[PDB]
Amino acid sequence: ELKYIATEASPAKVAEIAEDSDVYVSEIEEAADILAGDPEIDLGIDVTDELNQLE
Amino acid sequence: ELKYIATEASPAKVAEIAEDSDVYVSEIEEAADILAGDPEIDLGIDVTDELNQLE
């Protein structure tokens, strides 16, 4: 049985499946930040001073 | 009967099956330490000093 555990807790496979998860994690989180990319448009198209009179 | 015990308590086989177990044991235990490999990422990506103000 130690052989059968060591077949499938193989450190050759533990390290594979751990590395794969990390790449997908940074792929998804950065794909959330470009999903919030529009602040760069909002801060750009509106620069309106005039309301300092309104202030 | 001593012959039949000595056929299957053969020291040629006792020493084989004892050596095989030890290799699988170190294979599995080290495959547990690479299963805890992520502390190296946690200690790396977060180094945030600023909270010393918050402290």
Numbering used by the authors:
A (entry chain U), B (entry chain U): 110 to 164
Question: What do the authors of the reporting publication say about this deposited model?
Answer:
The ESCRT machinery mediates membrane remodeling in numerous processes in cells including cell division and nuclear membrane reformation. The identification of ESCRT homologs in Asgard archaea, currently considered the closest prokaryotic relative of eukaryotes, implies a role for ESCRTs in the membrane remodeling processes that occurred during eukaryogenesis. Here we show that Asgard ESCRT-III proteins of the Lokiarcheota self-assemble into helical filaments, a hallmark of the ESCRT system. Notably, the Asgard ESCRT-III subfamily is substantially reduced compared to eukaryotes with only two ESCRT-III proteins (named here CHMP1-3 and CHMP4-7) encoded in some species including Loki and Heimdall archaeota.
Next, we determined the cryo-EM structure of helical CHMP4-7 tubes in the presence of CHMP1–3 and DNA at a resolution of 3.6 Å. We were able to determine the structure of 36 nm PspA-like rods at a global resolution of 3.6 Å and a local resolution ranging from 3.0 Å at the inner rod wall to 6.0 Å at the outer tube wall. The rods are arranged by helical symmetry with 1.05 Å rise and 173.9° rotation. Thus we, relied on the strong density to build a model for Loki CHMP4-7 α1–5 into the density, while no density was found for helices α0 and α6. CHMP1-3 is, therefore, not a regular member of the symmetric rod assemblies while it may be part of the curved filaments, involved in nucleation or occasionally bound to the rod assemblies. The structured elements of CHMP4-7 adopt the canonical ESCRT-III fold: α1–3 form an extended hairpin, connected to α4 via a short linker (E117-P120 Fig. 5B, inset). Helix α4 is separated in two parts by a short loop at G146 and connected to α5 by an extended linker (I154-E159). The monomers are arranged in a j + 4 repeat, where α5 of chain j packs perpendicularly against the tip of the hairpin of j + 4, forming the typical ESCRT-III assembly motif known from IST1/CHMP1B. In the assembly, helices α1-4 make up the wall of the rods, while α5 together with the tip of the α1 + 2 hairpin forms the spikes on the outside of the wall. In CHMP4-7 rods of Asgard, α5 only interacts with a single hairpin at the bottom end, which is a common feature in eukaryotic ESCRT-III assemblies, while in bacteria top and bottom ends of α5 are interacting with two hairpins connecting two layers of the assembly (bottom). Therefore, the Loki CHMP4-7 assembly more closely resembles the bacterial configuration with the characteristic spike, while the Loki CHMP4-7 monomer adopts a conformation closer to previously determined eukaryotic structures including the α1/2-α5 interaction motif.
